Write a protein that binds this ligand. Sequence first.
Ligand code: HEM
Ligand SMILES: Clc1ccc(-c2cnc[nH]2)cc1
Length: 452
Amino acid sequence: GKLPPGPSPLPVLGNLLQMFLRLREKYGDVFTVYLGSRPVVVLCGTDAIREALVDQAEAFSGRGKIAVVDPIFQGYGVIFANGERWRALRRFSLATMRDFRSVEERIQEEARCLVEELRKSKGALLDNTLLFHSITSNIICSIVFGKRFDYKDPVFLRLLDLFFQSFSLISSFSSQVFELFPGFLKYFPGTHRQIYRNLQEINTFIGQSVEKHRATLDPSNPRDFIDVYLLRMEKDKSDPSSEFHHQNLILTVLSLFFAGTETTSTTLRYGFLLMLKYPHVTERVQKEIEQVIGSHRPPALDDRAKMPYTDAVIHEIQRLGDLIPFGVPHTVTKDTQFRGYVIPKNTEVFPVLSSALHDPRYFETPNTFNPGHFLDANGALKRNEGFMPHSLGKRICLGEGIARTELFLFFTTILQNFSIASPVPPEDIDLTPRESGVGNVPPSYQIRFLAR
Ligand code: HEM
Ligand SMILES: Clc1ccc(-c2cnc[nH]2)cc1
């Protein structure tokens, strides 16, 4: 057969001289795009993403490559694995992170520390970027290492700087050009060398933690993901077919930090910029916190079901946020039939999540902040099929539950204790991203946390 429609490519440049959502109106919801010397099928709109990821879930359950980090991951780890490797790691990961209320108690604890830290500034202007990277890194440190770090620790901070520098280098023009031609640019200096060095330095720290965990291991009292994985690693020691080896341990742990920090942190950074721009919304979240939780006890995950306005605001922050606008690349596991077109085995697929989050079928005002998008006539929370910020299908975000608990407990715990102000008036606040790509990031801003 033939691949979906699209612009006619060129020998090596592919469709370079024709550069996803731009091409949609001419070719359609599903089209073929050549990113140099490789073809990609793009899925635009809620229904075409749902058709592929939900209706043909096993076929679209493959994972593609991100050329700038593929030299680190090399198909290992829970995010970038495929086939049996992926199934075994994902199954083990859901099971272990589910075995350790404790993720909620640790998020509550991390929110109590954040309040304590914001209270020391005493209403001073600060850039919350570093503290939001720190609380989301501390939830994973707690899960994978069985402990958290102090916000003023220089070991912790040196690893964050180096790590968050990598996300900025990944979602950049330099790295975007690398994706189009990495078989040629790998031989020259570029951001790929810095991304490589920064993630190798974090892998070295993970490797040290794993040997320290093994050296202090109590097999009858596992305390975290690494301990559990080391016990599965000694169980499967005899089987050479086992996926539970050292290379998958380091790159699974890296995968959880790579995925579990940047995006949640930015969601919180973006949310506080919207709460600065729309104080009537922040005031209303505080009114709802005051009625359900009050001012003495801290927020708990059970409070969310009784706080639909706050819950709707958080949905709208993720929707308008649109942090992963093209999704994480997929691949077809076989030669698939899709809308009359034939997608050959191993072809890369891009579920353009942004086109679902801004779909005018499901959102009255797609480009405007409207918490009413998730509230019905009775003031109750309603969800629609356009809301897919964590994607869907078999590759659906493994930390969806963690991420959603973090946003609830950090937004409400901060707002119960603090009000916010900025030198920029609400009407002059801009929400333009700082660096687009695999991970959206908004512009840096200043904010005061005023104790109540
Ligand atoms: C607001 C925060 C977050 C957002 C918007 C988000 C979004 C996404 C998206 C769009 C994908 C791609 C799914 C696909 O390939 O179709 C994904 C995958 C993934 N997420 Fe997240 N995520 C968030 C937080 C987290 C957290 C906190 C964790 C870890 C605790 C995590 C772990 C993962 C993993 C391991 C994958 C790969 C799943 C697989 O390939 O099987 N994420 N996420
Ligand atoms: Cl290349 C890439 C891979 C995974 C993520 C991710 C998963 N969940 C949150 N972030 C982001 C970017």
